[PDB]
Amino acid sequence: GSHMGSFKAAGTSGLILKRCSEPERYCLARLMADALRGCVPAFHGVVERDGESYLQLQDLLDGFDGPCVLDCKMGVRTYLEEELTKARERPKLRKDMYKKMLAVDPEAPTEEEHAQRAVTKPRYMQWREGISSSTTLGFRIEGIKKADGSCSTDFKTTRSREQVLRVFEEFVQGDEEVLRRYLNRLQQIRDTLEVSEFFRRHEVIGSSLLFVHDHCHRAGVWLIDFGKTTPLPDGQILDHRRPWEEGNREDGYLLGLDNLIGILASLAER
Numbered sequence: 001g002s003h004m005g006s007f008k009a010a011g012t013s014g015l016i017l018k019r020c021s022e023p024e025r026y027c028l029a030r031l032m033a034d035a036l037r038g039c040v041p042a043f044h045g046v047v048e049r050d051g052e053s054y055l056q057l058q059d060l061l062d063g064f065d066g067p068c069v070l071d072c073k074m075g076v077r078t079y080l081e082e083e084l085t086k087a088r089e090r091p092k093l094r095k096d097m098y099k100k101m102l103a104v105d106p107e108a109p110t111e112e113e114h115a116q117r118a119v120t121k122p123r124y125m126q127w128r129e130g131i132s133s134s135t136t137l138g139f140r141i142e143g144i145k146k147a148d149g150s151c152s153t154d155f156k157t158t159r160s161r162e163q164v165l166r167v168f169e170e171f172v173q174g175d176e177e178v179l180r181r182y183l184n185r186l187q188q189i190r191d192t193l194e195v196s197e198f199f200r201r202h203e204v205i206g207s208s209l210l211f212v213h214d215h216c217h218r219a220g221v222w223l224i225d226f227g228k229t230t231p232l233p234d235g236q237i238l239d240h241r242r243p244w245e246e247g248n249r250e251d252g253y254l255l256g257l258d259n260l261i262g263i264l265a266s267l268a269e270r
């Protein structure tokens, strides 16, 4: 029906406001003119509310009757290469990130991080990639919202192919029509990404695929969250499958989508 951190209710039916960020506004504007137009929420421009700038977006939940939502962060890498430079030259030590790390694996921090009670953001995000499916499969499940109002973010150690398959199995609750529609949509999104002028020219970091379905078997998938999507310099391009090595700006986005399609196709045959 409706999603209502960065989000505020819109006056217009079927819309939602997201706090405006310059990289995301730039990306959504380009995307409305790109092959990927239909694969992302409609962007209607910027509006002012309480002296603050908001993106006016399609409410992706509007068409659905009690939507189930799964957020799937795409890519082998989940931070910008400029974070690695900033961490080397002027590290901003993060005490919060030390605690969240220690909570999962007490042996994960180094002797020096224990002494600092703090880690760098890139170190934290790299660790998060390795205990989840990000490093190996190129995506990870971030969270689910169920039709029963229940929600979960308890997926930080969901890593193996079979562990991911079991989360989707529980998410679709044996609805063969929803799974088939999800797979048809992912196949069409992959085809669109492989021809998109935007996609070949941009490093797509920290974006998600949002899976939405309802008890009426309606099913949609959209790309969201372009806050860390940045253009490559002087007409250089990415293949989005080859391994990341600092300098090459590769994000493994399509490695992730390939594996995600493979897992849902496997689930469909179970």
Ligand SMILES: Nc1ncnc2c1ncn2[C@@H]1O[C@H](COP(=O)(O)OP(=O)(O)NP(=O)(O)O)[C@@H](O)[C@H]1O
Pocket: 003, 005, 006, 016, 041, 057, 058, 059, 060, 061, 069, 071, 208, 210, 224, 225, 226, 227
């Ligand atoms: N256009 C949309 N319509 C409806 N729901 C949306 C829309 N965009 C985002 N959402 C919901 O809001 C969540 C957060 O979206 P996102 O754009 O990733 O924001 P964020 O502030 O970067 N949050 P996060 O990724 O968790 O750090 C999604 O997982 C959806 O549940």
Ligand SMILES: O=P(O)(O)O[C@@H]1[C@@H](O)[C@H](O)[C@@H](OP(=O)(O)O)[C@H](OP(=O)(O)O)[C@H]1O
Pocket: 078, 100, 121, 128, 206
């Ligand atoms: O999910 P946990 O383990 O809490 O970690 C979050 C991570 O999920 C999120 O993606 C990061 O934001 P970003 O994607 O804009 O970099 C955030 O950074 P920050 O906003 O704290 O700097 C981390 O703290």
Ligand SMILES: [Mn+2]
Pocket: 206, 207, 208, 225
């Ligand atoms: Mn996000």
